[PDB]
Symmetry: C4
Subunit: 280 residues, 4 copies
């Protein structure tokens, strides 16, 4: 039996737009400046800069989308139907593309350090062609469900832009797929690559070969640190869905609020990328 | 139908005076020392020092005004009528002068970096004459409404020093004007100048030409960061005024409290300026 | 008409002992090590070390006293009458001696910088003889009221070790005296000395003459920063006592809790001194 | 008369698993990498590395145990009886082994600094043989009570994996023993060794002999700082047990919540060790 009394808190209606607007401004300015400096001009000296440019493009699209999130968080979504689908589409594109870009950065680091003897053609070919196919096509393929399912439906004057499925089985399947492709699958690749790099990092002593990984590792740990609590919340909610953590109706509201605040902090990570790009 | 039950919380009556007193002490000491070192003696080597001196003068006047704010925040305003007008006048003068001084600093940086070939007479003339007219006269012109409208009126033993207008149309018009002249109009100029500087900052390599902007950019970002949440709150309240975010009487109190605390943190920025002047 | 319903919160009964115990350990270890290194051995190279040794002795005595505070904060004071007087005596001695030691440090800095031409005998004589008389005798003279007035009296099984006076006039007079001799009187001397030093610090350029003040100024600002909120709270309470801020019975409890927590943070400063002594 | 209404808060059921999962990931990765770099390869240049390897092994075992804690914190313990005993066994092993390893590090530092004249054979023999016996055997001997007493018992559908004793005398005796062997006994040894080192550290001037203690002292202070509040909470609870702090039924719940959160932060220390190992 579904519960009731689900509504947004008064403090949240003012706290969330502040976060969204700060992320709006910071992300737009930083990503635009990074794109202008890197792509338009000639500043790509290393191979990580191209992946960082892809990251900047995805983050710029998402932060452009954000003001609709900020407006919706206050009162409601009652300004169209196609805009809900569009917002969900860029959301999913950025969400599934940033992690794959990070995994490609880790793979490039592994190929550059472990097989430094003769590997420049593999790195170049992988970089160009595989980043295009591997990092983008799957993002669109996972946005495919967004076109079909995203919609806005009112329920006694309650207009919500929310993905709707005929049954809860679709809900749990898609949440588990989100977890698997967002955290577990690329996390294993990143961990394996960096562990092998660390094991092989026992030649001569500290040098540029040892200090070249600092920026990449800081970026990766920051990206995953701002995302972990949201993943924990959604995993707990999905477990509640399959009659495993049945504990009453007062747990679902708490986990939902956890999910919302942690989504806001993930968008904070989306802004945190160019900030890391500033310090150098 | 206007709501009721508007009163200050017991915790606020002790939290606000603490912030006001800390700002009192820090701002007075720092601004006085900066004025004494810079104006009275001969320590103006660069051109940013004169604008910083103007900023120090404005902040010193505001922090001198502050103890009346601290006294009012506790119980009430029942110690005159002309003092309310005076307090509002220096408040508005500082509020509309600091942003214009920052915009002039940004303009000077743009003229110094982009057109470094032959530009010293434009910088000197602009600095002196335009800072006087452009940065001050408009501040007084925007304090003009304060003389007319600021007043203290009791309502069943409720003495409030608050600007009063015949209709809410004046309220929304003046709030929108405050937003436009405080955040949007100078922010665009600052962003354009610094973006053009960044685009043109691609000659030779890192040097004093690249490290001269650090203090100015830190000052500007700090100034705007301590002000953004207050602007978000007032924008939301103004939207509530024009029957757009009608959501009940429990949202207005929350946004009012948001506005108060964020005003206190803005005064914290007013103190944060000389602190930035200390580290060097 | 005095109000009722005055009792300690359940969370406070566990929060306060934690702070007291942390301060116990840190202060005892740091002050003991500082005394052992400085007094017993020969490590006094400068003239600030002797004043710092006096500060260490006073702080060591206070932190030795602290566990009685920690025990009292939990349940009650029912383990004697002479111990209450003793605890109040060392409390007052440390409280009125630390500020005077800081003022003497500031005076020594002023004499060392402004009159560096011929001043070593004034500094030595002042240091020894005036620190003894000026910094100690007045502390005992202000502890004189503690012997007379400190006592423990039960009121329906409520044993409180609290200073008792026949009238509230004594209460307000002694609170105002505490404020005047704790913050205003030495603060003016410190501010005047450092302002004159800053005005006279315009010879040659940055050197040891400019970097010798860093530790002293950091110590002084930390000392006053951990104390300001408590002084604000007691000033507000004293004003409530003289029928000035009459606002109901719900303000006194809030200001009392403010006073308690801020006292704990002041003891945190008492521990913060040797920590500043560690970094160098 | 025992009280009632003991249950976990809804917010705790989501806050605790987040901490447990973060500690899971960070501890496993860091400790595994440290073990792989140090033990498997040849990177033990100093004598502190062996004790740090022992610490890493113990922390790795505990963080492996942790996911059962995370699962239990949500709903209940209803997935066995032998697993409760096992979890308690590794918990106690790590808890009583980390402090002894720290004490051995302090003893090695004392022997290396105070008796640097002729002491290499004592350090080697002590290191190997005494770390094995002294640091391990007692840990197992103190886990001996865990085998006997750890159990899961339901009480009206309340399955709790909790140590059970016939009387409260056993409870207070074992809590006092835990405090004595966890904080007081090794703390005295560490303090004595470091105080004697500081007293003897008055030869020549600052050098490697003075900078070799930084990492060890930082590790020790961090270890004890993340543990002190939990010890304060358990001491207060044990005092409540022996009819000393009888203050009602509303104090026990608060101290229990204090204990839980502080346990989580102690596990945070368990993760903080390899982080300290990263910065160098
Ligand atoms: C409050 C908001 C507007 C502040 C924005 C702060 C961030 C986003 C700004 C401040 C400093 C800026 C960076 C400063 C320097 C560089 C290095 C250059 O090679 C690329 C541009 C880049 C990377 C800028 C990106 C945008 C940037 C990071
Ligand atoms: C049809 C719907 C799904 C469109 C949404 C996806 C769009 C926004 C994506 C898909 C392919 C993407 C492009 C793929 C490759 C490049 C080249 C790179 O150097 C900069 C980014 C850029 C130019 C991307 C921009 C964003 C992009 C156009
Ligand atoms: C000065 C800057 C920060 C303003 C830009 C931030 C914008 C995007 C945010 C701040 C507060 C938000 C407003 C508050 C929420 C609503 C409710 C909706 O019924 C009308 C749109 C409206 C009124 C929002 C528009 C977007 C908004 C104004
Ligand atoms: C998800 C919500 C709670 C936001 C969390 C943001 C925090 C947890 C993230 C964002 C920025 C991150 C930090 C970015 C920079 C540094 C300094 C570097 O030398 C170590 C990593 C460290 C210390 C990161 C730790 C994790 C971090 C602090
Ligand atoms: C473990 C530490 C080091 C990282 C930070 C974890 C905790 C402290 C942070 C991360 C996410 C944060 C939570 C985000 C979501 C919620 C739920 C909401 O209803 C209250 C705020 C609250 C409760 C925040 C409390 C603090 C929080 C849980
Ligand atoms: C608690 C309160 C009183 C502390 C005040 C702290 C601030 C305001 C003080 C502490 C250090 C001081 C600065 C220290 C050094 C300089 C550099 C000199 O070229 C101008 C004076 C100036 C700029 C001082 C300004 C005031 C200052 C910034
Ligand atoms: C009539 C009412 C509005 C008066 C309020 C505005 C007053 C306080 C303002 C207006 C003009 C201002 C002056 C304009 C220019 C200078 C020169 C500069 O090197 C230091 C500040 C100083 C000296 C300003 C001090 C403050 C000032 C006198
Ligand atoms: C450290 C102190 C002395 C610096 C200045 C403190 C001031 C700002 C503090 C301390 C004394 C306090 C004031 C004393 C006088 C009054 C008048 C009364 O009707 C309202 C309370 C009020 C307004 C108090 C508010 C807070 C207050 C003004
Ligand atoms: C408005 C209320 C919440 C006060 C907010 C104050 C905060 C948000 C402001 C005040 C001081 C500011 C900081 C001042 C100094 C630094 C260090 C510099 O290297 C980067 C900018 C940074 C990091 C600023 C970030 C924004 C900042 C932290
Ligand atoms: C987005 C981050 C990085 C910058 C800080 C934004 C938030 C966390 C800060 C800035 C302004 C702060 C708020 C200022 C005003 C209010 C409303 C008041 O009723 C409760 C305090 C509260 C709620 C503060 C909570 C935290 C706050 C919102
Ligand atoms: C948790 C508790 C026990 C930690 C105690 C930390 C503080 C008090 C300890 C840690 C480092 C110690 C300092 C380290 C170095 C010095 C410099 C020497 O010339 C005098 C001793 C002195 C000044 C020590 C004083 C005590 C000290 C500051
Ligand atoms: C009778 C009551 C009030 C006694 C309480 C005050 C006692 C504890 C005070 C008063 C005089 C003080 C002494 C005065 C001078 C010195 C010399 C100095 O190099 C170290 C501290 C030392 C040794 C002080 C120790 C503490 C002291 C003995
Ligand atoms: C292990 C370390 C931290 C213990 C030392 C801290 C001591 C001083 C603190 C911690 C908690 C405090 C206890 C809690 C409060 C009471 C109530 C009183 O009716 C008996 C004394 C007693 C029981 C306190 C004794 C002092 C105490 C134990
Ligand atoms: C009274 C309660 C709230 C405790 C307050 C403690 C705070 C406010 C105090 C204690 C320690 C102090 C800091 C100690 C060290 C530094 C770093 C130095 O480069 C500038 C001063 C600064 C930044 C001090 C600021 C004030 C400070 C942060
Ligand atoms: C102004 C800033 C920079 C310095 C810190 C000031 C404020 C934020 C700090 C200093 C003292 C702190 C207060 C100490 C006393 C109280 C009263 C108690 O019932 C709740 C905790 C509370 C409310 C603390 C809240 C935060 C606090 C007021
Ligand atoms: C979010 C999680 C996965 C991040 C894990 C961060 C910590 C545990 C990682 C990040 C940096 C890593 C360290 C980086 C460098 C070294 C030095 C080498 O001589 C041993 C491995 C060691 C000691 C690594 C241990 C594990 C480590 C400390
Ligand atoms: C029977 C029960 C109690 C077993 C639980 C204790 C186990 C896990 C403990 C007891 C003895 C321990 C070993 C003792 C010594 C060493 C050698 C050292 O270089 C690495 C750790 C290692 C290899 C330990 C691993 C963990 C260990 C096997
Ligand atoms: C994506 C990563 C963070 C997941 C790994 C964290 C794991 C160990 C944590 C996160 C939340 C926890 C879940 C929440 C609590 C329960 C209740 C129990 O009735 C079933 C197990 C289950 C469902 C837990 C399994 C362990 C769990 C999933
Ligand atoms: C028990 C719960 C509250 C967790 C507490 C964690 C805090 C108190 C611990 C964990 C990490 C520790 C810090 C680790 C690193 C440093 C920097 C070093 O130069 C001084 C010690 C210092 C400053 C430690 C202070 C104590 C510390 C901050
Ligand atoms: C003394 C300072 C410097 C170190 C940190 C001590 C305090 C502030 C920290 C350490 C442990 C923390 C507490 C851990 C446990 C509890 C009890 C729970 O019901 C509320 C959270 C609360 C209340 C935390 C509040 C803050 C806390 C007490």
């Amino acid at each position: 039996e579904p519960c009731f009394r689900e509504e947004n808190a008064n403090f949240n209606k003012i706290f969330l737009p502040t976060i969204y607007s700060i992320i709006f401004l910071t992300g737009i300015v930083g990503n635009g400046l990074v794109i202008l400096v890197m792509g338009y001009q000639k500043k790509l000296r290393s191979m990580t800069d191209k992946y960082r440019l892809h990251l900047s493009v995805a983050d710029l699209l998402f932060v452009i989308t954000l003001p609709f999130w900020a407006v919706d968080a206050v009162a409601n979504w009652y300004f169209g139907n196609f805009l809900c689908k569009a917002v969900h589409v860029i959301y999913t594109v950025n969400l599934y593309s940033s992690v794959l870009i990070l995994a490609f950065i880790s793979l490039d680091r592994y190929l550059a350090i472990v097989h430094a003897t003769n590997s420049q053609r593999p790195r170049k070919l992988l970089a160009e062609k595989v980043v295009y196919v591997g990092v983008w096509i799957p993002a669109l393929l996972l946005t495919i469900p967004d076109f079909i399912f995203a919609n806005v439906s009112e329920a006694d004057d309650r207009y919500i832009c929310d993905r709707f499925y005929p049954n809860d089985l679709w809900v749990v399947v898609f949440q588990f797929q989100h977890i698997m492709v967002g955290l577990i699958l690329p996390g294993i690749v990143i961990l394996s690559c960096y562990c092998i790099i660390i094991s092989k990092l026992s030649h001569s002593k500290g040098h540029q070969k040892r200090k070249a990984l600092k920026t990449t590792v800081i970026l990766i740990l920051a990206f995953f640190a701002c995302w972990l609590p949201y993943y924990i919340g959604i995993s707990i909610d999905s477990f509640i869905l399959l009659e495993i953590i049945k504990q009453g109706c007062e747990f679902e509201n708490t986990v939902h609020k956890w999910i919302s605040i942690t989504e806001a902090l993930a968008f904070f990570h989306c802004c945190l990328n160019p900030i890391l790009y500033a310090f150098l």
